[PDB]
Design a protein around this ligand. Sequence first.
Ligand SMILES: [Fe+3]
Ligand SMILES: [Fe+3]
Lengths: 275, 275
Amino acid sequence: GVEDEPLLRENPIFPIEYHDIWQMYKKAEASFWTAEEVDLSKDIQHWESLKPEERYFISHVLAFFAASDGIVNENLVERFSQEVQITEARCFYGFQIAMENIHSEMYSLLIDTYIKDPKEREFLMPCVKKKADWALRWIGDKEATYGERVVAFAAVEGIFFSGSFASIFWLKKRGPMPGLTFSNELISRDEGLHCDFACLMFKHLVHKPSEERVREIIINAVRIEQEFLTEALPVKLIGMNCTLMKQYIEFVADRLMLELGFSKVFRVENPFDFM
Amino acid sequence: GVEDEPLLRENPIFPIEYHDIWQMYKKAEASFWTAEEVDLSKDIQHWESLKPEERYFISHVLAFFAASDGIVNENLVERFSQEVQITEARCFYGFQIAMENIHSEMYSLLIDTYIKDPKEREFLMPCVKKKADWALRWIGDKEATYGERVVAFAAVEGIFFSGSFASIFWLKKRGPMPGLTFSNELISRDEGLHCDFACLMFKHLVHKPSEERVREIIINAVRIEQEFLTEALPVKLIGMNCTLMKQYIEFVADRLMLELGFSKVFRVENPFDFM
Ligand SMILES: [Fe+3]
Ligand SMILES: [Fe+3]
């Protein structure tokens, strides 16, 4: 029933029809940044002073972020930006793809700098790919509605990285590593705005999935993220409490629900007062 | 015969396989700019001091540039960036789409500033759309090879605007209009790099059209551009010699041929020593 969707139906570019969308493109635009603005010189001095558990962890979280912004960008290219046929939402998606490419680079500048041997670089991982069946499936499914798929990538960019951004912010106070922590600040701000944008699109969608459907996608997204940070790569390795991290995930997942216009599912407070 | 094309065949992102491509993305990246960096305040003072032939002309050239970067960007979205399946050429196309959106905006900031009444804004035009059958056809044709279609948009971004960029550069010395002339400097630099990139892709294409095919696309592109500037909207209106403009087109069209790796077709010198 796509004819009834203002967002998706075909149409006849500074007569601004969608101010809320446009205001976010210019917000994304105004936060432009490139890898070379992030000084990584002063880092190996700190990476050297780390524990070895703190390196198996930081290296792995960086590597999960490599196999992550590539799936986000494979979806906006060959699905989202094709479908959405209104002008303002295409500029944003156009700018988003540009930044997802810079994020992808930044993570690789980091991994090249913290790992000089290519044989190490090769794990990619049965550790990480738990989300493939959830994620890459919402690229691959031809029955998945736009509405389901918008909520889906709201979850990827807002739940799935949330813990990892929390980790780097935790390391940052304990103490610095300006490459990791300055990139992370910029990258976590970008993902918030992308995640907010996914929400704005949802709001403009007449036909959306039932609450139970939206809850399912999010609840399930959270469990997979909780599993990654408490078992597959415990934030224990860098001195953090698992329970608190499982709980932060849920705070973030609830904050998404409120923003998609639905009720809290978990009701937990934010455990981390730095976030 | 797409399996034999390194550029197009499927494949397994900072192991840099294509340095020449990457070096251009970072060149595009480093030349990032947004509309708000172009001060349009100081312009109506000069637009006021124009002749009325100089306004029917500048307004129309701006309007041709509105119905122009929209077709360039409709091709990279729903054709080019889909097909090209190598990493470096996707970042560039990703960054290109971002800038084509900013160009499209800039032209609209200009037209809104030089034309306060929307009833004027409405011509779009049987004047302009001569290229549709040539251009939008190379979006619409499912028989057109990549090679033909890469040369095609090399022509759009390098021939089709060339005269118009020449006009604004001519006005600039006679004298200023910093909005028009600063935008134009930035926009004509972007189109040169996009046009150079189209050339770099052509070079990396095993299977390309015969010289006669390449000559046809370019020769025909030139005639349509020559027609626009000497009949449909003569650069006479702003005091310029038609013959010289017909000849500049040909200098530019020859400079494209040399860069696609072929012989000159016209052998003319550059008539305009400001270009
Ligand atoms: Fe993102
Ligand atoms: Fe261009």
